[PDB]
Amino acid sequence: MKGILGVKVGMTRIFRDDRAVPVTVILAGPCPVVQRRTPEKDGYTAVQLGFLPQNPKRVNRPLKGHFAKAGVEPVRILREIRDFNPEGDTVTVEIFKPGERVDVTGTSKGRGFAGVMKRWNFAGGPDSHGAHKIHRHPGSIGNRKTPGRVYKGKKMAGHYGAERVTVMNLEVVDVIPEENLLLVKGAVPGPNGGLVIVRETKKA
Amino acid sequence: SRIGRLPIPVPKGVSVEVAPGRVKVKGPKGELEVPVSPEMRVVVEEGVVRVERPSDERRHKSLHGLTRTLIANAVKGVSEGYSKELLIKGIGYRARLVGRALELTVGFSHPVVVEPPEGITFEVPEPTRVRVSGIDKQKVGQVAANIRAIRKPSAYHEKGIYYAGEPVRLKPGK
Amino acid sequence: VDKPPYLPRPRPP
Amino acid sequence: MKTYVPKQVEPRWVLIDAEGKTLGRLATKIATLLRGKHRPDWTPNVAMGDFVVVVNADKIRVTGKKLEQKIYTRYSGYPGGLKKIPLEKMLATHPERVLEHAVKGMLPKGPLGRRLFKRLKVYAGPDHPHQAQRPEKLEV
Amino acid sequence: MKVRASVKRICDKCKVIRRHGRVYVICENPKHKQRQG
RNA sequence: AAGUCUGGGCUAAGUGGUAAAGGAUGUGGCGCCGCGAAGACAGCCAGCUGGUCGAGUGGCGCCGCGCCGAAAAUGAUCGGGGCUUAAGCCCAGCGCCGAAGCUGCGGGUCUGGG
RNA sequence: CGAUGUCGGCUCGUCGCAUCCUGGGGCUGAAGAAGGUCCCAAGGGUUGGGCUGUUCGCCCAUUAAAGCGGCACGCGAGCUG
RNA sequence: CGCUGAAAGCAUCUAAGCGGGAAGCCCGCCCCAAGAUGAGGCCUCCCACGGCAGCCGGUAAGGACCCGGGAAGACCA
Ligand SMILES: [Mg+2]
Ligand SMILES: [Mg+2]
Ligand SMILES: [Mg+2]
Ligand SMILES: [Mg+2]
Ligand SMILES: [Mg+2]
Ligand SMILES: [Mg+2]
Ligand SMILES: [Mg+2]
Ligand SMILES: [Mg+2]
Ligand SMILES: [Mg+2]
Ligand SMILES: [Mg+2]
Ligand SMILES: [Mg+2]
Ligand SMILES: [Mg+2]
Ligand SMILES: [Mg+2]
Ligand SMILES: [Mg+2]
Ligand SMILES: [Mg+2]
Ligand SMILES: [Mg+2]
Ligand SMILES: [Mg+2]
Ligand SMILES: [Mg+2]
Ligand SMILES: [Mg+2]
Ligand SMILES: [Mg+2]
Ligand SMILES: [Mg+2]
Ligand SMILES: [Mg+2]
Ligand SMILES: [Mg+2]
Ligand SMILES: [Mg+2]
Ligand SMILES: [Mg+2]
Ligand SMILES: [Mg+2]
Ligand SMILES: [Mg+2]
Ligand SMILES: [Mg+2]
Ligand SMILES: [Mg+2]
Ligand SMILES: [Mg+2]
Ligand SMILES: [Mg+2]
Ligand SMILES: [Mg+2]
Ligand SMILES: [Mg+2]
Ligand SMILES: [Mg+2]
Ligand SMILES: [Mg+2]
Ligand SMILES: [Mg+2]
Ligand SMILES: [Mg+2]
Ligand SMILES: [Mg+2]
Ligand SMILES: [Mg+2]
Ligand SMILES: [Mg+2]
Ligand SMILES: [Mg+2]
Ligand SMILES: [Mg+2]
Ligand SMILES: [Mg+2]
Ligand SMILES: [Mg+2]
Ligand SMILES: [Mg+2]
Ligand SMILES: [Mg+2]
Ligand SMILES: [Mg+2]
Ligand SMILES: [Mg+2]
Ligand SMILES: [Mg+2]
Ligand SMILES: [Mg+2]
Ligand SMILES: [Mg+2]
Ligand SMILES: [Mg+2]
Ligand SMILES: [Mg+2]
Ligand SMILES: [Mg+2]
Ligand SMILES: [Mg+2]
Ligand SMILES: [Mg+2]
Ligand SMILES: [Mg+2]
Ligand SMILES: [Mg+2]
Ligand SMILES: [Mg+2]
Ligand SMILES: [Mg+2]
Ligand SMILES: [Mg+2]
Ligand SMILES: [Mg+2]
Ligand SMILES: [Mg+2]
Ligand SMILES: [Mg+2]
Ligand SMILES: [Mg+2]
Ligand SMILES: [Mg+2]
Ligand SMILES: [Mg+2]
Ligand SMILES: [Mg+2]
Ligand SMILES: [Mg+2]
Ligand SMILES: [Mg+2]
Ligand SMILES: [Mg+2]
Ligand SMILES: [Mg+2]
Ligand SMILES: [Mg+2]
Ligand SMILES: [Mg+2]
Ligand SMILES: [Mg+2]
Ligand SMILES: [Mg+2]
Ligand SMILES: [Mg+2]
Ligand SMILES: [Mg+2]
Ligand SMILES: [Mg+2]
Ligand SMILES: [Mg+2]
Ligand SMILES: [Mg+2]
Ligand SMILES: [Mg+2]
Ligand SMILES: [Mg+2]
Ligand SMILES: [Mg+2]
Ligand SMILES: [Mg+2]
Ligand SMILES: [Mg+2]
Ligand SMILES: [Mg+2]
Ligand SMILES: [Mg+2]
Ligand SMILES: [Mg+2]
Ligand SMILES: [Mg+2]
Ligand SMILES: [Mg+2]
Ligand SMILES: [Mg+2]
Ligand SMILES: [Mg+2]
Ligand SMILES: [Mg+2]
Ligand SMILES: [Mg+2]
Ligand SMILES: [Mg+2]
Ligand SMILES: [Mg+2]
Ligand SMILES: [Mg+2]
Ligand SMILES: [Mg+2]
Ligand SMILES: [Mg+2]
Ligand SMILES: [Mg+2]
Ligand SMILES: [Mg+2]
Ligand SMILES: [Mg+2]
Ligand SMILES: [Mg+2]
Ligand SMILES: [Mg+2]
Ligand SMILES: [Mg+2]
Ligand SMILES: [Mg+2]
Ligand SMILES: [Mg+2]
Ligand SMILES: [Mg+2]
Ligand SMILES: [Mg+2]
Ligand SMILES: [Mg+2]
Ligand SMILES: [Mg+2]
Ligand SMILES: [Mg+2]
Ligand SMILES: [Mg+2]
Ligand SMILES: [Mg+2]
Ligand SMILES: [Mg+2]
Ligand SMILES: [Mg+2]
Ligand SMILES: [Mg+2]
Ligand SMILES: [Mg+2]
Ligand SMILES: [Mg+2]
Ligand SMILES: [Mg+2]
Ligand SMILES: [Zn+2]
């Protein structure tokens, strides 16, 4: 397993073999390791990565201690990669070569209080023929006296998005190490400026 | 009308050691342990092994015959050794050896390669006879069946992988 | 399946 | 004369090797120990029973075909949320749960009964972490 | 395989065996193979 | 709350802890014939007989307990845990527990007799 | 009966399995291919139209298939009417 | 569907034991999750205050309030 932190920067298409290929561009490097989780000390294996330099004027003392024991400049984001342990003190985009397949994790766009149609793709109600103030309503939510209740997990309106999403097996179209840039084919969760994680794919 | 009480000839010079719930049989072709009911008693006589039971109730009778044959099979294994022979019938159908490995060319789009497990040896005389040989009788029996499964005898044609001495009973085509 | 109703379908007071 | 009621005493810690013991038959005794019904000054409305440490819970033994046939069950609240787990698998994955469930089912229901179950300390393997309280070995 | 509540011998070569709590009838003739159920 | 009580037996299905015709080398106990140290059933070598094997074998019926037959709709369960020479079932015992029944003690009221 | 709103549709499911399809089998009067028949299996799937208020049913064009039932003949303080 | 194999000299997938075998079952994938009161773990920071497991009082590391906002959002967060 191998991974990196990054920010989603935006989308384009490039040309490759007379084909237009949609890409999301990701700024991944550089991520210094700030702690290593060990089976003797932590009970599992991981690497804590830091990402994006931070004004020390904004970093409190308990945080300052953590960084210093690693001898690492103050960083804005800390995040772990599981079962990944790089030889170096620093992880960069170069761990990925074009052609590799990756898993990208981000925070989906937030739709706030979402209707039952937007959220769960319900059909809603009819728009004419007598429909009475139920054009976007969900219909029945149950049976009658048996069971006399509503199931746990009943799809209902409520918040939607702004939640952890991972899309898997994305082609790495190119990587531009001199700009800490990764070019991933297709769509990646979340807004531009969003923090994302790039891991080596789990598919075969 | 009995098997367990029938004594077991032991060739020179294979040794039969006895332990609680197991007997170890060594011989000129290897060793083999035989798990045995602690209810049964194995007996080391001269040039002979006997198994004795402790009652004439049903479960004990059943174990008795089994225990004697189990040890008898072990004795023969380390001395004479065991084998089973497979005939290959069918026009395109042949087998060959690739190292220790057995390669069946038996009608699929591909060939099938069988790996011999521990204690089992493969042989290819003609391209149409295969000898599975080992000191463990249930193991030789198994692997043999395994090989045969790859392409069981057809029901309509004298074609496929056959046991030596298994009859070719077929059904007619329309 | 087409059984007869048992309630008259409500009139206003 | 009114019936003697005990002031709080130091509860006894106790150790039991479960190796080769019959799940339900050991459970019965563990429960009794927990309730303190072996103590002549037993009182039904307080915790005055013993603390019971058990080792070798993975080596609990059971009769019949229960390894394959005994089924532990969990409902989650969701549709189709009944999970079934056989004895065999429970031992392979959470062996202490086997004894724990058995003893738990034999304690009273309610606030005291739940407190009593908390005084059960079950472990797979021969060792336990409670040398500090120096539990007394019990032959049951 | 035939599956019935009445498993019987069909020919002199049929054989009522019982394996794994189930009465089967096996035989040289494949048609005669039966499981009780 | 009171027996992990005592003695003999059956059951291996968790039967016990949901059902029928009917089906079965399940298991235990009775009984009945048939064949057989003049060599029987099985195995193997010939043509229902023959040869070496050296013991038993093969069918019928009754009894106990189990097996299948046995599919239905929210989450399962013998009340639960859990129980297998029993914590199941049959027979025979000894002891205990157990109600506002019975006893002991105290009291009330009515009725009857002093 | 000092009220348990009643068919069909729509919406939203969920469960059963006597399984329509897909998966695994045995028998076949199974040559192959394709079927028949029984067994295991409820994970998923199970189309769009014409007619009728219809459920149902016939019909058109497809499909791997166009399954049958329970949930107050599921669901009117959700809609229709 | 077999291997080995008695009871039952044969036979038998089974009574001891061992293989193969489903879109189904358990794990694996994605998400939630220590109120998991059985409240887990690791890194780092503060520290031994003044007055008669309690109390009042000022503090430490830190937090909140307020404010500019926000592909976060009904308010809250
Ligand atoms: Mg590790
Ligand atoms: Mg680990
Ligand atoms: Mg590793
Ligand atoms: Mg994150
Ligand atoms: Mg809207
Ligand atoms: Mg919308
Ligand atoms: Mg959506
Ligand atoms: Mg619609
Ligand atoms: Mg619409
Ligand atoms: Mg619509
Ligand atoms: Mg519509
Ligand atoms: Mg209207
Ligand atoms: Mg209106
Ligand atoms: Mg409107
Ligand atoms: Mg609605
Ligand atoms: Mg209704
Ligand atoms: Mg209810
Ligand atoms: Mg959110
Ligand atoms: Mg992830
Ligand atoms: Mg691909
Ligand atoms: Mg692809
Ligand atoms: Mg004999
Ligand atoms: Mg003997
Ligand atoms: Mg074979
Ligand atoms: Mg009204
Ligand atoms: Mg026991
Ligand atoms: Mg015990
Ligand atoms: Mg005790
Ligand atoms: Mg035991
Ligand atoms: Mg068992
Ligand atoms: Mg539900
Ligand atoms: Mg579910
Ligand atoms: Mg179910
Ligand atoms: Mg579940
Ligand atoms: Mg109660
Ligand atoms: Mg019949
Ligand atoms: Mg007949
Ligand atoms: Mg089986
Ligand atoms: Mg046969
Ligand atoms: Mg007793
Ligand atoms: Mg059964
Ligand atoms: Mg039961
Ligand atoms: Mg039952
Ligand atoms: Mg009957
Ligand atoms: Mg009988
Ligand atoms: Mg009998
Ligand atoms: Mg003869
Ligand atoms: Mg049954
Ligand atoms: Mg059922
Ligand atoms: Mg079923
Ligand atoms: Mg129901
Ligand atoms: Mg009771
Ligand atoms: Mg008894
Ligand atoms: Mg009275
Ligand atoms: Mg009185
Ligand atoms: Mg009176
Ligand atoms: Mg008077
Ligand atoms: Mg009425
Ligand atoms: Mg009323
Ligand atoms: Mg009313
Ligand atoms: Mg009303
Ligand atoms: Mg319509
Ligand atoms: Mg459904
Ligand atoms: Mg079925
Ligand atoms: Mg049917
Ligand atoms: Mg199929
Ligand atoms: Mg199918
Ligand atoms: Mg088929
Ligand atoms: Mg075919
Ligand atoms: Mg044909
Ligand atoms: Mg044909
Ligand atoms: Mg057919
Ligand atoms: Mg039929
Ligand atoms: Mg078929
Ligand atoms: Mg299904
Ligand atoms: Mg289901
Ligand atoms: Mg369904
Ligand atoms: Mg349609
Ligand atoms: Mg028209
Ligand atoms: Mg229409
Ligand atoms: Mg119609
Ligand atoms: Mg009809
Ligand atoms: Mg009609
Ligand atoms: Mg017509
Ligand atoms: Mg088809
Ligand atoms: Mg249609
Ligand atoms: Mg139909
Ligand atoms: Mg339906
Ligand atoms: Mg339905
Ligand atoms: Mg009805
Ligand atoms: Mg219905
Ligand atoms: Mg309906
Ligand atoms: Mg209705
Ligand atoms: Mg319906
Ligand atoms: Mg309603
Ligand atoms: Mg209405
Ligand atoms: Mg309506
Ligand atoms: Mg209502
Ligand atoms: Mg066979
Ligand atoms: Mg054999
Ligand atoms: Mg044999
Ligand atoms: Mg034999
Ligand atoms: Mg077995
Ligand atoms: Mg058995
Ligand atoms: Mg197996
Ligand atoms: Mg095989
Ligand atoms: Mg699939
Ligand atoms: Mg998480
Ligand atoms: Mg916590
Ligand atoms: Mg957490
Ligand atoms: Mg605590
Ligand atoms: Mg809990
Ligand atoms: Mg914590
Ligand atoms: Mg930990
Ligand atoms: Mg200080
Ligand atoms: Mg002071
Ligand atoms: Mg203060
Ligand atoms: Mg603000
Ligand atoms: Mg937002
Ligand atoms: Mg705001
Ligand atoms: Mg605020
Ligand atoms: Zn037959």
How would you characterize the overall build of this protein?
This is part of a larger assembly, with chains A (204 residues), B (174 residues), C (13 residues), D (140 residues) and E (37 residues). Chain A is mainly beta and 204 residues long. Helices cover 7% and strands 41% of the residues of chain A. In chain A, strands 1-2-11-10-7-12 form a six-stranded antiparallel β-barrel. A four-stranded antiparallel β-sheet of chain A has the order 5-4-3-6, covered by helices on one side. Chain A is extended. Chain B contains two helices and 13 strands. With 174 residues, chain B is α+β, with helices and mostly antiparallel strands. Helices cover 29% and strands 18% of the residues of chain D. In chain D, helix 1 (23-35) crosses helix 4 and helix 3 (87-93) packs across helix 4. By secondary structure, chain D is of the alpha/beta class. The structure holds magnesium ion (MG) (121 copies) and zinc ion (ZN). Chain A binds three RNA strands through strand 3, helix 1 and strand 10. The PDB classes it as ribosome/antibiotic. The entry lists the keywords antimicrobial peptide, antibiotic, 70S ribosome, inhibition of translation, 50S ribosomal subunit, peptide exit tunnel, Ribosome-Antibiotic Complex. The entry is titled "Crystal structure of antimicrobial peptide Oncocin 10wt bound to the Thermus thermophilus 70S ribosome". Chain A is 50S ribosomal protein L3.
Summarize it.
This is part of a larger assembly, with chains A (204 residues), B (174 residues), C (13 residues), D (140 residues) and E (37 residues). By secondary structure, chain A is mainly beta. Chain A has helices at 61-70, 116-120; strands spanning 3-15, 20-27, 31-37, 46-53, 75-82, 90-91, 101-107, 112-114, 158-160, 164-176, 181-185, 195-200.
| Strand order within the widest beta sheet of chain B | 11-12-7-13
Shape of chain D: globular
Q: What is the CA–CA distance across the termini of chain D?
A: 37 Å
DSSP helical segment count of chain D = 5
Oligomeric nature of the chains: part of a larger assembly
Subunit structure (chain D): Part of the 50S ribosomal subunit.
GO molecular function, one term (chain D): mRNA binding
Pfam family, one (chain D): Ribosomal_L13
Protein name (chain D): Large ribosomal subunit protein uL13
Features:
part of a larger assembly, 5 chains, A: 204 residues, mainly beta, six-stranded antiparallel β-barrel, four-stranded antiparallel sheet, 2 helices, 7% helix, D: 140 residues, alpha/beta, four-stranded parallel sheet, two-stranded antiparallel ribbon, 5 helices, 6 strands, globular, binds magnesium ion, binds zinc ion, RNA-binding, ribosome/antibiotic, Oncocin 10wt, antimicrobial peptide
